[model samples]
Target: LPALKLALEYIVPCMNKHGICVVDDFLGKETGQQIGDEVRALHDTGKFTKITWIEGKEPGCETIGLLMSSMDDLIRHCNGKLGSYKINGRTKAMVACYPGNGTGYVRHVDNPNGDGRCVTCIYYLNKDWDAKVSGGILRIFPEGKAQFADIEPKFDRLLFFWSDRRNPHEVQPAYATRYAITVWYFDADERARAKVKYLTGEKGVRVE
Candidate 1:
C-alpha cells in the first residue's frame, strides 16, 4: 500500500499534465502470458469483430468483448491501487487485436461525445515486439500538443490516460499481431444524472 500510494502520488501529477502514462510490468509475467495466450486463442477462433466508427467514417480495429465480471475485477483492482486517482466506473472492456497487414485505427479520443467516460486504460499483451519489425505503436498527443509519443506495444505494459477531448491517440499499422486489453471507465453519478434528465425529457442522450 505504501509503495503504491507513493507511486500514485508521482503518477497522478504526471498524468494530469501529460494526460497519459505508461506503466511497465503491470501484471506478473506468468499471469500476463496466460491471459495473452487465452486472448490469442479467442482471436484465432474469430471471436472478435471489427470495431465500428462511432461518428466519423474512419476505420477502426478488431475487438472481442470481455465478460462483465472480469471487467468488475479489473475495476476493483485499479481502485484498490489508485483510490482517489482510480477510474470510477467500469463501463466497457475488450481485447483488440491489430493484425499485421497495414491495418490500424486513425487518431481519436476515447469519449468523443463526453458522455460519462473519465479514463482509458489499455494493457498490452504482446511479447518481444520489435518496433522496427512490427509497427502497431500507440501514438498519443499529450495535452493536445503537436509533439507526440510513439509507444511500442510491449508485454505486461499498461497505459493510463484521461478519456477527455485533449488526449487524441492512434495505433500504427503492424507487421505482426498486436493484442491489447482496452477498458473505459466512467463517472457513474454523472451518467445516472444524464439518464434521469433523459427520462424527464430535460436532455435527450444516447445510451450504451
Candidate 2:
C-alpha cells in the first residue's frame, strides 16, 4: 500500500499535466515473468480468440487474477488523488496479444463514442523486450502538443492515461509477440448521462 501511494505521488501529477503516466517495475521482475509465462502457456493452448478482448478468468492466470483484485484500491487512490472526477466502476479485465506478424492497431481514442470510459490502465507482460528488434511501442499523441511520446512495453510496466480525446494513441507494429492487460474506469454519472444522450440522439455528445 505504501509503495502504491509513493508511486501515485508521481503518477497523479503527471496525469494532471500530461494526461498520461508511465511507471516501470510496477509488479517487479519475478511476478511479471510469472504472469508472462502463464499468458504464454495459455496462448500455446490456442484458447485465446484472435483480434478480440479476452475477458473473464482463464486457467493459469492466477497472478493476473490477483492483479485484478487490487484494481479497486488503485481506483480509490486515483479518485482521491485526481480530485477532478470520480471513478465508480471499471470494465472487466481484458488481455490483448499481438502476434509477430508486424500487425498494429490503428490510432484511436478510447471514448470517442462517449461510452464513459474516463481512464485507461494497462500493464505489460513482455519479458526481455528489445525495442530495436521486437518493435511494439505505444505511441501517444497528447492533446494540443506538437510532440509525441513513445512508450516501450517492457515487463512489469504500468501505464495510465485519460481515455477521452486528450489521448490519441496506437500500438506500433510488433515483430515479436506482445502481451498486455488493460482495464478502463468509468464515471457512473457520466456513463448514465451518455447513455441517456445516446438514446435521445442528443447532439454534441459523441466525440466521433
Candidate 3:
C-alpha cells in the first residue's frame, strides 16, 4: 500500500510534467521472482509468440500475454492505484521477451493524437539485470527536447507514462534475453486488436 500510495502520489504530476514516472522495487524481489517464473514457464510452453514483421525484417521479440485469469488480483490492484490518479482505462498485459543479438522496437508512440491509449505501465520482470549485461533499455523520448531518458529494465521496476503523441519512445536492442511485463491503459473503448488475443484468450486481462 505504501508503494502504491507513493506511485499514486506521483502518477499525475509526473506524467503531466515529464510524461513518465518509474517505481522501483514495486513488487519486491521475492514476489517478482515468482511472477518471473510464471512468465518463463509460459514462455517454455511455446506460449510466447513471435511478432510479424510488418515494416522491418524482424520485430525484435516474442510475447506471452496475460488473460483475465492470470494474476487478475494484481491487475485489479494496479487499476486501484491508477484510479486514484483519476484514470479509469482499459489495460492490456503481456510478457515481452527480447532475444539477444540486437533485437528491439524502433521509435514509436503508443497512442498518437489522443488515440485512446491514455497511459502505459511497464513492470520489469528481469532478475539481476545490469546496465552492461542488459541492453534492452527503455528509451523515453523527450517532447521537443534535446535530451531523453534511458531507463534500465531492472527487476521489479515499474514504469508508467502518458500515451500522448509527444511521448514517443522505443526499446533498445538487447544482448541477452530480456523480459518485461508491458501493460497499456486506453482512455476509451475496447477497440484494440491484439496480435496474441486469439492464442492467449479472447478476453485479455479484462472482464468488462
Candidate 4:
C-alpha cells in the first residue's frame, strides 16, 4: 500500500503535466519474477501474438491475470488523482512477444481514431535485459516537443501515458526475446459515443 501511495504521488503530477510516467520495481522483485516466469512459459506455448487495433483473446495465465487485476485496482486508485478523466474500464490484457530476431513497431498513436482509449499501461517482463544487447527500447515523442525520450524495456518496469496524439511512440528493433503486457483504459462515456458514431456508418472506426 505504501508503495502504491508513493507511486501515485510521483506519477500523478508527471502524468498530468508531461503526459507520461515510468516506474521501476512496480510489483516488487518477487512478484515480478513470478510474472516473468509465467510469461516466459506462456511464450513457449506459442500464444503470444502481434499487435492489432482490434481486441484479441486475452492470455490465459494465472500470474498475468492476477497482475491485470492489480492493475485494475491501481486504475481505480488513480481516478481520484486524475481529476476529471475517469478510467471506467480497460481492454483485455495483451501479452506481446518479439522474437530473438530484429522485430519492432513503427511510431503511432494509440487512439488515433478517437476510440476512447484514455490511458495506456505497459509492464515489461524481460529479466536480466541488457540495454546494450537488447534493442527494444520504447521511444516516445512527447507532446509539442521535437526531442524524444528513450526508455529501456527493463524488468518490472511499468510505463503509463496518455493514449491520444500527445504521445506518439514506437518500439525499437529487438535483438533478443522481449516480452510485455499492455492494457488500455477507456472513459465509459467516450467509448459509448465512439461506438455509436462508429456503428452509424462513420469511416475509420477502429475500436479496441
Candidate 5:
C-alpha cells in the first residue's frame, strides 16, 4: 500500500494532464461478462468502427455500457508514481470486440502520441470464449518481454492495467466473436477527448 500510494501522487498528476498511464496485472482467475446480446444490440445501431471516435460529448453517452469509476482510488493511489499526470476520473475498465478468426491485433503499444495513456481497462464479454480455442489471448509486453494471459470466453472477465504503451500488447484472433470494453485514462486534451469520441463513438467515463 505504501509503495502504491507513493506511486499515485506522482503518476496521477502527470497522467491526468496527459491522460496516459498504464499498469499490469495477471490475476490468477478469470471473471468476465456475458453481454453478447446487449453488445450486439448496441453494435447494430450505435455506429460501428474498427478503432474509436470519442469526440462529441453527449449528455448521457455511455462507454462499453458499464464500468463506473472503478479506478478512482487506484489512480489517486498511484498519482505520484505516475509522475506529472492529472486525473479527473479514472476508467480502468474497458471492452474489446474483434471478429477476425485468423487475425486479431498486431504487436503494438496502446497509444501513439506519447506514453500518455494512463489506464487500460478491458472486460471480456464472450460467454463461450475459450483460450485453448487457438487464439484470443492478451499478449502483454511490459519491459519488452511478452507474457500471455488466458481470457477464456466462458464468463465476464475484466483486465485492468496502467496504460504504459511500453507494455506493447496484442490480441490473438479467436475462433468465435471476441468482445471487450477498453478504457484509457488521458491527460486532458479536448483533441484527445475528441479522438476518443472518434475512436469508440462514445465519451470518456470519469473516475471520480
Candidate 6:
C-alpha cells in the first residue's frame, strides 16, 4: 500500500500532459481479490455480456466506472483537467467489456447522441498483469511514432483523457481475462438520438 501511494506521488507530475496514469496493485491485496472474484463470478454466470454499461439515470448500470473516494471529486478533477479546465455540462458513468474475442473498443468516442464526448475514463482492476501475458493496453495515437502515454492494465491505475471525436483509441485485446471498468463523461450537450434510454424510461428513450 505504501508503494502504491508513493507511486501516485511519482505519477502526479506526469499527469500534466499524458492525461493517463497506471498503478500496480491498486485495490490492496484482499480488496482486489474480492473485486476479481466478483467479476469472475459475474462472467461465469453464463449471462456475462461482452460489454455491460450503466449510465446516468440508467438502472442496473449506475455504478459502472468510478472507484474514487468521492465520485464528485473524480468528476471535478476530470472536469478540471480535460479540455484545459473547461467544464462542459453533465456527466455519466459507463462500463465496457471486450469478451476476450479480440474485439475491443473500436477507436471511437461516446455520445452518439450528438454530444461531444468530454472525458474518457477507465479504472483498471488487474493485479499482476504482464504486457506479454496480458493484452489490455490502452493505446493512443502518438504524435510521433512513439506514443505520449501508454496505460498498462495494472490494478488501480486510473486513466483519463479528453475525447473530441478525434482522439482514437483501442484496447489491446485481453490475451487472458482482464477487468477494466470504464466511464465516458460528457457535458449535457448531446441530444439523445440512437442513445440508450434512461432507467427512468424504457429502452432509454431516444429524443430526436
lDDT of 2 by residue, 1-208 (tens): 5646744777778888888888788778888888788777776777678433444466677788766666556667667566466777777677888987998899999888778788898989888999899999999999997899999999889888989888999999999998898998887777878767765224544675
TM-score of each: 0.73, 0.86, 0.71, 0.85, 0.58, 0.64
Off by over 4 Å in 2: 51-58, 195-208
Q: Which parts of model 5 have CA positions greater than 4 angstroms off?
A: 1-34, 51-65, 71-85, 89-95, 144-154, 188-208
Q: Tens-digit lDDT track for model 6 on 63-169?
A: 23225333345455444434343444344433445556565566554433344345566676677778677677777763333544556777756665556443466
Question: Which residue pairs clash within candidate 2?
Answer: none
* Model 1 Cα lDDT, one tens digit per residue, 69-150: 4334544544534324434566445667777887889999877765666777777878888888898988988774678898
lDDT of each: 0.65, 0.80, 0.62, 0.80, 0.51, 0.52
Model 3 scores what on Cα lDDT?
A: 0.62
Lowest lDDT sum, 10 consecutive residues, model 5, at: 25-34
Model 2, position 50, has a per-residue lDDT of 47
For 1-208, candidate 4 gives per-residue lDDT tens digits of: 6646854787778788788888888787788888778777765666555532213324546777777877777777677576367777788777788885999999999998888788999999899998799899999999897789999999999988989898999999999988889999887777878878765223555777
lDDT string, candidate 5, 130-173, tens digits: 67764677766556334544444334554445465555677777
Candidate 6 residue runs with Cα over 4 Å from true position: 1-16, 19-27, 44-47, 54-71, 77-81, 84-93, 101-105, 111-116, 142-148, 189-203, 206-208
lDDT of model number 2: 0.80
| Residue 82 lDDT (model 1) | 39
Worst 10 residues of 4 by lDDT: 51-60
Error of 1 at 195 (Å): 3.4
Winner on lDDT (1 vs 5): 1
Scanning candidate 6 in windows of ten residues, the lowest lDDT window is 57-66
Q: What residue pairs are clashing in model 4?
A: none
